[PDB]
């Protein structure tokens, strides 16, 4: 019941917190059970706005956040562990990118692997990460979608992509001389490792230079986003096909099929 | 050169980083380079400690270190990027247990599934959670060893156990009808998932109890260091099977032979 908190906060002593940390992670949790509160993300967070409410600090709140997040991963609930991260501070962004910007740039590629990386970060809209990550065992050619492995601890995604796309792919892995995982590696002394995101960045400025506009990687899983919309794609599923409970694969490979993306400009 | 850095800024911008952090870790990223320090986690630690005999706080130091980790993770360079990790508060630890102890509380355990977990925990010194995570897979019976994977971004590590310990694995795995990948599991109304690191303390709390002796999991993996020193086993061996550049594999299945820790009880 409770001789579970006392081992909880060894256990922290242990991992090399402080033991002021520790008396207030400890505080913190045991009010948490104090309440009723239940051992999961939802009653975490309606825990914590009810002390915002009551006034607590930026800080006060993340250490609470924390707090709740290390008990969890004791409790073993790593399910509902990752699930509280402290929202990221949403910026404005760039004016969204037009039909025919996104044509000049995609056309100013030097080569076929350039083209498929911007083509995909616009037509998949996916994450700088998503695609330095993505592995071309995850190209489905059978169901025609890409399959976004879920991250440190998110969850799989599934981006339905045109023929002309898979076409492209299949026409650029042929021409593949390596053993790599990825579908995308860069030329170094050690030859044919993966891309970072520096160089995913160094990239995308430089045909956003050739087709004269300052342009970053994020531009264009945006204009991904607006695009999807203004054709008529509802929020919700686009807000699927993105990532950040009716969820469905036969209708995103229809509703994608819609937009008619990527055909719009190759 | 540089117009990398105005890069990795909006990066921290996208990633919802505070301006005026993005204002900071864009300073010492340039001085850093500045002093001329390549992109590894040896010249960051050449360059914090400078600032800490320059008299910088740890709030401070502690925001450089992960404005670096932050631009290696950019660079790609996630090698030198998980080295940073800034060292754990060191504590002092109960009294190491005897091999009177040791003995008295596996013998104490109701079930081999218990007394397996002890014995791994002590005869291996695992960690709670190398423990909790184990793959079956990763016991070896041909060389004779346990496979402990790295972690998170640590590395794989090697430790080899005794025949005695095999033997009760096997023993212990035919007895299992469930398809869990795990060397071990709890049973729950969803049958057969994951122990917790709440679980392994539970149980250890149990069986010290009966053995009359306020314990913890660390205890049993610091006794294993302790014996295996006393036992006269060199530091660095039982550093490396710990884990926390001469290395071998031959030489620790001989070595913890010499040792016969865990047949000194079992
Ligand atoms: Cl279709
Ligand atoms: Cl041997």
Redesign the pocket.
């Known amino acids: 019941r409770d001789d579970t908190i006392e081992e909880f906060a060894t256990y922290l002593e242990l991992e090399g917190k402080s033991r002021n940390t520790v008396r207030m992670y400890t505080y913190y949790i045991s009010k948490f059970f104090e309440e009723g509160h239940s051992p999961t993300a939802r009653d975490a967070l309606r825990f914590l706005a009810k002390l915002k409410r009551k006034g607590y600090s930026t800080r006060s709140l993340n250490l609470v956040i924390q707090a709740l997040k290390a008990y969890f991963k004791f409790e073993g609930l790593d399910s509902e562990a990752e699930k509280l991260k402290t929202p990221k501070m949403p910026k404005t962004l760039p004016k969204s990118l037009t039909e025919e910007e996104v044509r000049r740039i995609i056309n100013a590629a030097e080569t076929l692997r350039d083209r498929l990386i911007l083509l995909l970060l616009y037509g998949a809209g996916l994450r700088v990460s998503e695609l330095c990550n993505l592995r071309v065992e995850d190209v489905n050619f059978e169901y ?1 979608v890409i399959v976004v492995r879920g991250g440190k601890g998110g969850k799989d995604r599934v981006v ?1 992509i045109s023929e002309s796309l898979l076409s492209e792919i299949k026409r650029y892995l042929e021409s593949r001389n390596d053993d790599s995982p990825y579908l995308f590696v860069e030329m170094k002394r050690k030859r044919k490792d993966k891309l970072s995101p520096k160089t995913v960045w160094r990239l995308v400025k430089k045909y956003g230079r050739k087709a004269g506009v300052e342009l970053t990687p994020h531009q264009l899983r945006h204009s991904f986003a607006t695009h999807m919309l203004e054709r008529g794609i509802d929020i919700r599923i686009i807000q699927e096909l993105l990532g950040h409970t009716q969820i469905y694969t ?1 209708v995103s ?2 509703h994608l ?1 819609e937009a008619v993306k990527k055909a719009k400009l190759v």
């Open positions: 025609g339905p036969k490979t229809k099929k």
